[PDB]
């Protein structure tokens, strides 16, 4: 099941020819979709929201200035 110290999945890696490697469950999920190597071929939330909203209309404002020159 899950590691008793940290409560994470503790699951085996599978390695592939090309070198790269991944969790067994993650790789399988992908194989289900495509038979290739996924890598090659084969703090308050409110403060964050406000920063993001403010950068959006600063981008706009600044765009207007560059356009009007």
């Amino acid at each position: 099941d899950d590691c008793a110290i940290c409560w994470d999945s503790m699951q085996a890696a599978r390695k592939l020819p090309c070198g790269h490697l991944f969790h067994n469950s993650c790789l399988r999920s992908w194989l289900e979709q495509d038979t290739s190597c996924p890598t090659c071929r084969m703090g308050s939330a409110d403060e964050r929201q406000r920063m993001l909203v403010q950068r959006k209309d600063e981008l706009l404002q600044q765009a207007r200035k560059r356009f009007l020159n």
Partner: protein
């Protein structure tokens, strides 16, 4: 869930070092599956200083599948549908450069800022725009200019 974990980590990473002219994140951290991205037309490109809002709608199984990306404003561009849906290789689910779990919101946006500067002439979300981009490059530059004006509200 994997999707939500990836998305939270991409947003944090994204925010640390945002590429010039791109602001992207969830519209509300209560739902990381729905983001807005503002992209600015790079300078000295034909969509110069345009500011284009797009919505990214992420699938439950992300990053196994791409988000849908839809520009919310008006656009005239060979790789964008009438409704605003963006159609490029990286956004298509599984000889192009399709979606793999190793892509990211960031790489999607790099790709999209790229297509604004250098269209995929032979791809037909927008036939009219494709043709003109070749035959009447001169008009296309004019239509592009009024598309910028509009995105800016002017």
């Amino acid at each position: 869930g994997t999707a939500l974990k990836r998305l939270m980590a991409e947003y944090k990473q994204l925010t640390l070092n945002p590429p010039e002219g791109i602001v992207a994140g969830p519209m509300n951290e209560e739902n990381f599956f729905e983001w807005e991205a503002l992209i600015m037309g790079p300078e000295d490109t034909c969509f110069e200083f345009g500011v284009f809002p797009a919505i990214l709608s992420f699938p439950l199984d992300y990053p196994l599948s791409p988000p849908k990306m839809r520009f919310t404003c008006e656009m005239f561009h060979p790789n964008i549908y009438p409704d605003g849906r963006v159609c490029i290789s990286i956004l298509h689910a599984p000889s192009a450069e399709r979606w793999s779990p190793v892509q990211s919101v960031e790489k999607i946006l790099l790709s999209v800022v790229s297509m604004l500067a250098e269209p995929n002439d032979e791809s037909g979300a927008n036939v009219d725009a494709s043709k003109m981009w070749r035959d009447d490059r001169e008009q296309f530059y004019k239509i592009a200019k009024q598309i910028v004006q509009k995105s800016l509200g002017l």
